[PDB]
Structure 1
Amino acid sequence: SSNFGAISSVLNDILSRLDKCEAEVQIDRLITGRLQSLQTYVTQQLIRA
């Protein structure tokens, strides 16, 4: 539910009102944040294991 500095946290809200030229930088801020959140989860799970 976090947006990581983008206009909104919903990926179907950026693609609904931004063209293919402006939405490249807004999507690529959500992908990086969600990737690092998943990586933090995997590191914590490895230490717990």
Structure 2
Amino acid sequence: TLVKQLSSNFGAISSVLNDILSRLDPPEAEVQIDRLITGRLQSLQTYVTQ
């Protein structure tokens, strides 16, 4: 379940960090990358608590 959740968008336009990165300007990609970061931190924290 932890390895999966790297394929989840969490609301961004893509789960591939580079695709977001190489397909938008910095100020617009920052929000998407922050959304991915928040989702992945939440997943890792859930794993650690369990």
Pick the TM interval, shorter chain.
0.7 to 0.9
Q: Which has the higher contact order (CA 8 A, sep 6+)?
A: 2
Unaligned segments of structure 1, at least 5 residues: 44-49
**What TM-score results when the alignment is normalised by the length of structure 1?**
0.84
* Residue of structure 1 equivalent to 2:12: 6
Question: Number of aligned pairs?
Answer: 43
Q: Does the alignment pair 1:33 with 2:39?
A: yes
Structure whose residues are more often helix by fraction: 1
Q: After TM superposition, which residue ranges in structure 1, 4 or more long, deviate above 6 angstroms?
A: none
Identity of aligned residues (%): 95
